[PDB]
């Protein structure tokens, strides 16, 4: 028979094969063994069930693994195979309408999306916190931080400069194609998910927001926009292509464990969210860059990430660019 689930298995494979992500959760959950031992846990968006199993292995007495997508059936099988059907219960459907037989001592979730908030489960985690978490209960991870840095994307630089190099390899001048490539690769307002490295970072990364997931008011902040101002000074001479946005989340130490998606840290499946200017801007050592960045819902869809960027490079006028996934 033929099936249409290629994309489903690929997404879950990618996440479990992301050792930085999956080991951070394994260890972050285990670091909280004292708080989980003999207690009940809700896993929001449990996927294949692996995190729910990690919670049982950390000593949870009972775990409710809630998953709305088709993969919930595989999670139930995984739980059975690990001998945990008596303690880990897979419940299909969205957490907003699931019926648990009790409130829980902790919520665990891998809820983060590209750019932190694209197609994230954060609103579901917060809904579950309000509805099902006992007073004083634990959230894992507990917090998130957002970072921005100006970038000179070496891969993009190569793509833009490719056309001017055709002559040296094939004896045909194609340098005129550079303007075309620039318009096409940079003159749009889409957020681009791409992995960078430290070599691409043009100034010290700046933290522009911190989200304490248990804090009052966070749901309203998400609707109004999460963001802040930033300022920095460039390391050296390079074409500025725009900005990269990334995040980290923190698991309480029960030394806290941080799962980072920085280009300076080991690669993850989240990569970074890139915000390209319409064309490169030359900068030099100590060129000042300032601005404001805000992560917003889209009008049609609160889970489609919009980023509004205001930026000022050196003595140039401040500019605005409104991006979306």
Residue 119 appears among annotated catalytic residues: yes
Q: Per-residue DSSP letters for 282-306?
A: EE-TT-EEEEEEEEEEETTEEEEEE
d(CA 106, CA 62): 11
Q: Which does 110 bind (CB under 5 to 8 A by kind): a copy of itself, Ca ion, none?
A: Ca ion
Site residues for a copy of itself per CB under 8 A: 1-6, 8-10, 13, 16-17, 19, 22-23, 26, 48, 50, 53-54, 57, 74, 77-78, 81-82, 159, 162, 166, 169-177, 180-181, 183-185, 187-189, 278
Residue 110 appears among annotated catalytic residues: yes
Choose among 53, 213, 63, 221: nearest CA to 124: 213
Question: Rounded to the nearest 10 degrees, what angle do helices 50-57 and 72-81 cross at?
Answer: 30
Q: What is the CA radius of gyration of the chain?
A: 22
d(CA 247, CA 238): 25
Dihedral sign, CA of 69, 121, 259, 251?
Answer: negative
Indicate the residue among 17 and 134 with the shorter CB distance to Ca ion. Answer: 17
Indicate the residue among 145 and 178 with the shorter CB distance to a copy of itself. Answer: 178
- The residue from 14, 23, 85, 119 that is catalytic is 119
Q: Is 37 annotated as a binding residue?
A: no
C-beta of 158: minimal distance to a copy of itself in Å?
Answer: 10
Total residues binding Ca ion (CB under 5 A): 3
Choose among 235, 223, 224: nearest CA to 285: 235
Q: Which of 110, 133, 148, 257 binds Ca ion (CB under 5 A)?
A: 110
What x-and-dash track marks residues 226-245 binding Ca ion by CB under 5 A?
Answer: --x-----------------
Q: What residues does 315 pair with on adjacent strands? A: none
Contact region with Ca ion (CB under 5 A), list: 29-37, 64-72, 99-107, 194-202: 194-202
Dihedral sign, CA of 267, 294, 221, 146?
Answer: positive
Contact region with Ca ion (CB under 5 A), list: 61-69, 221-229, 236-244, 287-295: 221-229
d(CA 264, CA 303): 27
C-beta of 120: minimal distance to Ca ion in Å?
Answer: 8
Choose among 281, 311, 320, 302: nearest CA to 189: 320
- Is the Cβ–Cβ distance between 85 and 79 less than 8 Å? yes
Q: Is 195 in the site for Ca ion (CB under 5 A)?
A: yes
Q: Is 12 annotated as a binding residue?
A: yes
Terminal CA-CA length for the chain: 35
d(CA 91, CA 87): 13
Q: Is 199 annotated as a binding residue?
A: no
Q: Which does 57 bind (CB under 5 to 8 A by kind): Ca ion, a copy of itself, none?
A: a copy of itself
Q: Is 21 annotated as a binding residue?
A: yes
Indicate the residue among 181 and 308 with the shorter CB distance to a copy of itself. Answer: 181
Q: Which does 282 bind (CB under 5 to 8 A by kind): a copy of itself, Ca ion, none?
A: none
Tokens of 65: 């693994």
Farthest CA pair distance, the chain: 74
Q: Which does 228 bind (CB under 5 to 8 A by kind): a copy of itself, Ca ion, none?
A: Ca ion
Q: Is 67 annotated as a binding residue?
A: yes
Annotated binding site: 12, 21, 45, 67, 96
Active site residues: 110, 119
Annotated binding site for S-adenosyl-L-methionine: 12, 21, 45, 67, 96
**Contact residues for Ca ion, defined by CB under 5 A:** 110, 195, 228
């Amino acid at each position: 028979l033929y099936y249409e689930c290629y994309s489903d298995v690929s997404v879950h494979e990618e996440m479990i094969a992301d050792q930085v992500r999956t080991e951070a959760y394994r260890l972050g959950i285990l670091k909280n063994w004292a708080a989980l031992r003999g207690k009940t846990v809700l896993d929001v968006g449990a996927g294949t069930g692996i995190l729910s199993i990690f919670c049982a292995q950390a000593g949870a007495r009972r775990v409710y693994a809630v998953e709305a997508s088709a993969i919930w059936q595989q999670a139930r099988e995984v739980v059975r195979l690990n001998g945990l059907e008596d303690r880990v219960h897979v419940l299909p459907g969205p957490v907003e309408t699931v019926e648990l037989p009790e409130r829980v001592d902790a919520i665990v979730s891998e809820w983060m999306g590209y750019g932190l908030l694209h197609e994230s489960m954060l609103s579901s985690v917060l809904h579950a916190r309000t509805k099902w978490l006992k007073e004083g209960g634990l959230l894992l991870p507990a917090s998130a931080e957002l970072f921005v840095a100006p970038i000179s994307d070496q891969m993009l630089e190569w793509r833009l400069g490719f056309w001017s190099q055709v002559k040296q390899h094939y004896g045909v001048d194609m340098s005129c194609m550079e303007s075309f490539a620039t318009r096409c690769l940079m003159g749009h307002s889409e957020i681009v998910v791409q992995d960078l490295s430290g070599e691409d970072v043009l100034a010290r990364p700046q933290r522009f927001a911190q989200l304490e997931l248990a804090r009052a008011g966070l749901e309203q902040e998400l609707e109004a926009g999460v963001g802040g101002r930033f300022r920095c000074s460039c390391y050296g001479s390079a074409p500025l292509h725009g900005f990269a946005v990334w995040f980290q989340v923190t698991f309480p130490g029960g030394k806290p464990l941080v799962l980072s998606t920085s280009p300076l840290h080991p690669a993850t499946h989240w990569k970074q969210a890139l915000l390209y200017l319409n064309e490169p801007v030359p900068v030099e050592q100590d060129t000042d860059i300032s601005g404001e960045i805000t992560l917003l819902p889209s009008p049609d869809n609160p889970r489609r990430l919009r980023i509004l960027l205001r930026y000022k490079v050196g003595d140039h006028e401040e500019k605005t660019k409104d991006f979306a996934m």
